[PDB]
Design a protein around this nucleic acid. Sequence first.
DNA 1: GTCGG
DNA 2: GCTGATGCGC
DNA 3: CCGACGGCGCATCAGC
Length: 324
Amino acid sequence: TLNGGITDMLTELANFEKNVSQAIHKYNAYRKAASVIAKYPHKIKSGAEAKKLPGVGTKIAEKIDEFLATGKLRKLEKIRQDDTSSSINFLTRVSGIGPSAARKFVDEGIKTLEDLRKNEDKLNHHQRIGLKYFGDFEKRIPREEMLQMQDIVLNEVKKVDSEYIATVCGSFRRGAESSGDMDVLLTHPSFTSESTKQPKLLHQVVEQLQKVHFITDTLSKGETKFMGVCQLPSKEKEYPHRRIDIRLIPKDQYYCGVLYFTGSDIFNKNMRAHALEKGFTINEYTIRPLGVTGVAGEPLPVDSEKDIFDYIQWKYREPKDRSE
DNA sequence: GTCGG
DNA sequence: GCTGATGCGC
DNA sequence: CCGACGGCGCATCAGC
Ligand SMILES: Nc1ncnc2c1ncn2[C@H]1C[C@H](O)[C@@H](COP(=O)(O)OP(=O)(O)OP(=O)(O)O)O1
Ligand SMILES: [Mn+2]
Ligand SMILES: [Mn+2]
Ligand SMILES: [Mn+2]
Ligand SMILES: [Mn+2]
Ligand SMILES: [Mn+2]
Ligand SMILES: [Mn+2]
Ligand code: NA
Ligand code: NA
């Protein structure tokens, strides 16, 4: 927040490009600029100063000059005043409503929370849940509540089977003092990259979590991925409903998976980019050597996060240092 | 929108 | 009824 | 100056 005013402006521009313009590469360009500036250890005094940084170009330096001169941005004022733009941007804050749905609703005169309720019959299950918990999903979860959630999950998982391993990742693992949601990585000895598929490994855990009334709603559920809603038990003041993601991954790909799901998202983009500049392709699952005509080798042996960093020659960064 | 081809 | 096409979130 | 920029699990539904 040395340069908080500039990164806020870039984020808002990013959001417009994704939600209204449906221009995903521009969205990513703005987030890339906002990230590099956030890293930058000096108060930016001019566009020319920012232009020095990778990810910041001609148009963004011009925008930085204007914000710096006036404290605002003409484009953003116009956009914030534009009815269709403003409304599309708003509806996408509902989980389940993306750029296409929002634009479609707006074309139909649906543009507010109240309009959404009046027309709930036009919403799908995920969207109705998103409406239902609209305010709740916009609150942050403080680390104290995160640690209480960590306890319920690890313990209920134990009760399905003591050999399951559940690891909370995302911002919680990066040590952040508050979190957007809860991300849970799951492994079991019976499920590896070979293992011959066993139904209900994730289902068993999801059903227990439901049984103890921790998980209250399902958004999507399959054999490897559950997205849903959860809520700490109330004695007293009802706790807000939270989003929870659970991913079941093959035991022998656990470190790749832990690297990936700890993030951050920008950090992951940065790592896999740097990976290429060393002859490796990283995904959620494997690190593989690359070569000449684009031949990605077999997965290299990994038994620690750190092992991945070595392959690509980065100093090890503790989870706390990947929040980009 | 930005950068490397 | 089905499934390719597409959206959404990550 | 142009083209690349990450891909995937899951849900829904237009068009047969
Ligand atoms: N767009 C994406 N596509 C694929 N993976 C992603 C994407 N964004 C993030 N990830 C990975 C890296 C993140 O650390 C991890 C968690 O995603 P997510 O829960 O949405 O954000 P986060 O945990 O880093 O912070 P927070 O949830 O508190 O906002 O998933
Ligand atoms: Mn109205
Ligand atoms: Mn998270
Ligand atoms: Mn998440
Ligand atoms: Mn299909
Ligand atoms: Mn162009
Ligand atoms: Mn039909
Ligand atoms: Na630059
Ligand atoms: Na949304």
